[PDB]
Amino acid sequence: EDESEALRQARKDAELTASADSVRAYLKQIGKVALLNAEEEVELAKRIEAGLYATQLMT
């Protein structure tokens, strides 16, 4: 079903796998983080700008 820990146990068991194919291992690796939206991109870019200004003023 969609509950009772059967699906969760199957998912975690399949996630703790080998995947000897290097390309497939890389794909399963990238398939972790979710996608973003324009506001999140703008906020992240502002954070990077603040960080670079911070480090240049350190210098």
Binding site: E1, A6, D13, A14, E15, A18
Partner: protein, 1111 residues
């Protein structure tokens, strides 16, 4: 008969045959015509299945179109394939190295869904290679033939195995598709029927059924007798369709987070959507026949189905139960039994049409992928099908199939028989077929289903034994790819004249009679008990009432090349194999007289080989010459045929074509109008008729050695013409441009005598090993010279001559005249490869005589090299002074089990001398069954003994009894078939009679001049410093490991050291030993081998520290 100009070859055949030999090139011609969609194939299919006549290209385009996007808002389609006229004729293509092709045109239609718009365009698919009148392809000038392939047809295949431990049967099944995944339902040691999918063994059938949606109650209802399956249901330990789908996903798809909707569609994608699982039409037909789903439904929807899967599982369980018949709910009943892969009911024949269709499909798949990719990126409403379609993948796929593919073989042509037998050839090895290393002994066997579909005799005797075969004479190919065989149906003991074509399944179902069954000349059998082949290949005696089929004619089981062997039924099988394989290597002689004694498969084989000009429309010969024939048709129009005078075959043999008609003769459409390479008066002729002795003569004919009379050398009885070509290209270079000119550096005027003003040799100017054929010079560049060279140049006043000499020199061991020179140029606009400015071909031909070491062979595989050519005087001669021509050995006849040569010798002597049966008081009893116009024959008359129904031994004895004298009153050959020979060397007569006669022998293509080789010091390899190999380069013999072992075992050290160090690898040793030999000094001590140094460097490169230590 049935040939207007057929020479009168009297036959020994006892029984008439109703069916004539079909077109021997049908397997190629009809297949390629079906691929094209030609009107001939269309009307034939209309005669035999007009339900849906579809060509290969039409099928490919229909199964491709329409092509949609992911959104499905716009589509493209293909329709109406149509060919164009050939771009160049066959001879012009063969000369100018083009490919015999024709343009391809299709009607692409671009359709918009949301708005609605149709765009019809004429699209040029590509230059499609075409198949000529002789069923061969021409690629880059040379002639190629694509052999048909033997592959196992997709479908279901059940088998049973023994575990040899618990001793219980373990059934299984393999649903092997084309372009798909595998799945097997076996039976284990326990009672858990496994469902291994894609080599993942777990998960019994209950889980698969639940994933398909079957509840436990439905499973039990459909399978109640299955104790094994009810046990698996009890120990299923998995309940729920979604739980079963979850298990399916975690098993077949490790490493992917399973969901409840991806699993619901994964099975449908894997086995129900045609995109990824499409067993072909043959697979669907085979499955339908094996299970009996639909008996009348036209075949379509080539994807698998759940009803088929459950039927397969039920078939497995009932087979394990031990039932005899099965009835699918909603389908007819079908017997249950194991299936054999070697049975020809399952090994379909993928012919040239299907092979080229498959390559076309794999190219068009790439084309459709590119179309789909660019179809989304490019803006809508601004595209046309011309912009959509890319034809480069398709043409590249066609080219890469025709070239560099072992199923597209270089068409060997030593003789028309070689060409014809290279066509109709069935090869089991190839892409998608079994390889030699994986070829077990089981497949290299003559299954009892091969009778009439493949020759059990003819096959290569090397490592490819059994993997290569040839079609039978009467065999025919089913549209699916099965091999049919004609039969005459017998009804209540009445042998009718209706011919019905059967495949392996039908032949096994019914009961077949024997070809030489004693019919009563009315339709009935004289004896109720007749020979019969049963379903399992069993041979029994059966009452005539139960027989319902009969062979069309004897020699149906045999192929063409083997059917050309007289007295085959008396030969063994190994020697018949050798003779059949060695009849195809005979070289064309300069006279090519017809054989005295043979079979009826020489005229048909010659005229069907395509190497004999035949008038297409009847008429009267107007003008005849050595180059052309003009036939004046019955109605006004004329036609000229161009002969091929001294054209080079693909294997360096003459291909002359001499006319055989005069200036006033009348010819009927179908008559032979001109001989070929190995033809005589229309029929076939691979050799000559030679007088034969069977005595061992002074040890010169010892252990398959052959003695020849010098008369063959004198009168050119065995003298072949061989044509070799040389190619040299004057090409562009970094430092300049090479030119073809007389001015060759550091050369004398002596060797330039035979060269014309432009550089090439004269036509008809003879050449010798080491001469100059084409004078080519290359810009040498700037290079420092030795001080001694400078001193010599200053002394002699000669200049630097800054260009290097690289001229076409005839290689080692060639001679002969020069026939013609074909020279290409860039200035006259010829199609040359990029970077090549000048190309020139020189054809050198030599008239090779017969000589010691040459390979000779009869038609029964009694091969042998020529030991010694005696003069005419010192050879045994008959009482009248006629000397024999060849001298075989008697010891080689009995132990090889090939007395067919003895019978052929006797019959040949009878034919040459001429006979007359004396029926003064009735016809003699031994000749009671002899046909008419055979009791008496003129001298040097030809006869024709068929393969399995020919001259009997009693008839041979009777014929030998009457052997009418040559010129005086003298019967040189007694009743036994021997004669009194006189020793031409000593003089006294031989104390005992010796067999003589006229055997037919052929000159094989294993000449000494192509084999003799020697090397003192030549080129060396690149990575290692060992000499090269093969006669093409200079090359040296290979001193193998076994030879090294023998060298060691001999107690020998110094010879081994010499052969391994200062002869192969010592770079600073070879020059020293050569200098020592030249100067007369002792041979210096060797050094360590450069190969060993290379091995040390390689080991050091593999991160393995290797150090050689002194102490």
């Amino acid at each position: 008969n049935s040939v207007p100009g057929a020479p009168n070859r009297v036959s020994f055949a006892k029984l008439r045959e109703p069916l004539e030999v079909p077109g021997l090139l049908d397997v190629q011609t009809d297949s390629f015509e079906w691929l094209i969609g030609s009107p001939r194939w269309r009307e034939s299919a209309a005669e035999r299945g007009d339900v849906n006549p579809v060509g290969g290209l039409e099928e490919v385009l229909y199964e491709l179109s329409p092509i949609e996007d992911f959104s499905g808002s716009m589509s493209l389609s293909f329709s109406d394939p149509r060919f164009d006229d050939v771009k160049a004729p066959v001879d012009e293509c063969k000369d100018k190295d083009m490919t015999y092709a024709a343009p391809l045109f299709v009607t692409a239609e671009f359709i918009n869904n949301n708005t609605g718009e149709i765009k019809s365009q004429t699209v040029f698919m590509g230059d499609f290679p075409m198949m000529t009148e002789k069923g061969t392809f021409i690629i880059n000038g040379t002639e190629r033939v694509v052999v048909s392939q033997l592959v196992r047809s997709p479908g279901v295949y059940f088998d049973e195995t023994i575990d040899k431990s618990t001793d219980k049967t373990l059934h299984s099944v393999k649903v092997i598709p084309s372009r798909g995944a595998w799945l097997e339902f076996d039976v284990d040691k326990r009672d858990t029927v496994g469902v291994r999918i894609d080599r993942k063994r777990r998960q019994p059938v209950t889980v698969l059924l639940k994933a398909l949606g079957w509840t436990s109650e439905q499973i039990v209802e459909r399978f109640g007798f299955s104790e094994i399956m009810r046990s698996t249901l009890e120990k299923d330990n998995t309940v729920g369709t979604d739980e079963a789908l979850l298990d399916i996903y975690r098993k077949l798809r490790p490493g992917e987070p399973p969901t409840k909707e991806s699993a619901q569609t994964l099975l449908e994608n894997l086995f129900f959507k045609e995109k990824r699982y499409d067993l072909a039409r043959v697979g669907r037909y085979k499955v339908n026949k094996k299970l009996g789903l639909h008996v009348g439904e036209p075949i379509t929807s080539s994807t698998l189905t759940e009803e088929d899967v459950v039927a397969t599982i039920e078939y497995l369980v009932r087979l394990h139960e031990g039932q005899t018949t099965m009835t699918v709910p909603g389908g007819v009943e079908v017997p249950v039994e194991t299936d054999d892969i070697d049975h020809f009911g399952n090994r379909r024949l993928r012919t040239v049409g299907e092979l080229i269709q498959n390559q076309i499909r794999v190219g068009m798949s790439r084309m459709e992928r590119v179309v789909r990719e660019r179809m989304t990126t490019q803006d809508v409403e601004a595209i046309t099908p011309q912009t959509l379609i890319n034809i480069r993948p398709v043409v590249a796929a066609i080219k890469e199939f025709f070239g560099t593919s072992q199923l597209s073989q270089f068409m060997d042509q030593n003789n028309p028989l070689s060409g014809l037998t290279h066509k109709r050839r069935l090869s089991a090895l190839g892409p998608g077929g079994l390889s030699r290393e994986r070829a077990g002994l089981e497949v290299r066997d003559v299954h009892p289903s091969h009778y009439g579909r493949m020759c059990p005799i003819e096959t290569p005797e090397g490592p490819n034994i059994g993997l290569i075969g040839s079609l039978s004479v009467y065999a025919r190919v089913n549209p699916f790819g099965f091999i049919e065989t004609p039969y005459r149906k017998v009804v209540d003991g009445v042998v009718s004249d209706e011919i019905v074509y059967l495949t392996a399944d039908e032949e096994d179902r019914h009961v077949v009679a024997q070809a030489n069954s004693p019919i009563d000349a009315d339709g009935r059998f004289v004896e109720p008990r007749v020979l019969v082949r049963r379903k399992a290949g069993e041979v029994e005696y059966v009452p005539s009432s139960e027989v319902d089929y009969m062979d069309v004619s004897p020699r149906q089981m045999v192929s063409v090349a083997t059917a050309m062997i007289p007295f085959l039924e008396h030969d063994d099988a190994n020697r018949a194999l050798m003779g059949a394989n060695m009849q195809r290597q005979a070289v064309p002689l300069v006279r090519s007289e017809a054989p005295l004694v043979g079979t009826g498969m020489e005229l048909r084989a010659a005229i069907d080989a395509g190497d004999v000009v035949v008038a297409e429309e009847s008429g009267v010969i107007e003008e005849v010459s050595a180059d052309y024939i003009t036939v004046m048709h019955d109605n006004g129009t004329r036609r000229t045929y161009r002969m091929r005078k001294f054209a080079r075959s693909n294997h360096g043999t003459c291909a002359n074509q001499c006319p055989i008609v005069d200036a006033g003769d009348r010819v009927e459409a179908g008559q032979v109008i001109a001989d070929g390479p190995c033809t005589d008066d229309g029929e076939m002729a691979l050799g000559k008729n030679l007088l034969v002795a069977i005595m061992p003569w002074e040890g010169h004919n010892y252990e398959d050695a052959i003695i020849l009379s010098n008369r063959l050398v004198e009168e050119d009885v065995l003298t072949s013409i061989h044509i070799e070509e040389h190619e040299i290209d004057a090409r562009d270079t970094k430092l300049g441009a090479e030119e073809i000119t007389r001015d060759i550096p550091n050369i004398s005027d002596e060797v330039l005598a035979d060269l014309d003003e432009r550089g090439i040799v004269r036509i008809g100017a003879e050449v010798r090993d080491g001469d100059i054929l084409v004078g080519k010079v290359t810009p040498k560049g700037e290079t420092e010279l030795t001080p001694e060279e400078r001193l010599l140049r200053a002394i002699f006043g000669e200049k630097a001559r800054e260009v290097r000499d690289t001229s076409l020199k005839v290689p080692h061991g060639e001679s002969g005249k020069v026939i013609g020179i074909r020279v290409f140029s860039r200035e006259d606009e010829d199609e040359l490869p990029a970077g090549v400015n000048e190309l020139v071909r020189v054809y050198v031909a030599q008239k090779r005589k017969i000589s010691d070491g040459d390979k000779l062979a009869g038609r029964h595989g009694n091969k042998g090299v020529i030991g010694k050519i005696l003069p005419v005087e010192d050879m045994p001669f008959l009482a009248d002074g006629t000397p024999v021509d060849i001298i075989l050995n008697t010891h080689g006849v009995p132990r090889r089990m090939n007395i067919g040569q003895i019978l052929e010798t006797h019959l040949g002597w009878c034919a040459h001398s001429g006979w007359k049966v004396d029926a003064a008081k009735g016809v003699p009893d031994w000749a009671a069954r002899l046909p008419d116009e055979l009791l008496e024959a003129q001298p040097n008359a030809i006869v024709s003994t068929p393969v399995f129904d020919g001259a009997q031994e009693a008839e041979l004895q009777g014929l030998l009894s009457c052997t009418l004298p040559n010129r005086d009153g003298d019967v040189l050959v007694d009743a036994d078939g021997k004669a009194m020979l006189f020793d031409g060397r000593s003089g006294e007569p031989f104390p005992y009679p010796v067999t003589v006669g006229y055997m037919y022998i052929m000159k094989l293509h294993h000449l000494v001049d192509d084999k003799i080789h020697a090397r003192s010091t030549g080129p060396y390899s690149m990575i290692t410093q060992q000499p090269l190999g093969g006669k093409a380069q200079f090359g040296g013999q290979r001193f193998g490991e076994m030879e090294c072992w023998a060298m060691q075992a001999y107690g020998a050290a110094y010879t081994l050291q010499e052969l391994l160090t200062i002869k192969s690898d010592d770079t600073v040793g070879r020059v020293k030993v050569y200098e020592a030999i030249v100067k007369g000094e002792n041979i210096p001590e060797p050094g360590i081998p450069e190969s060993f140094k290379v091995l040390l460097k390689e080991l050091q490169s593999l991160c393995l520290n290797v150090e050689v230590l002194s102490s």
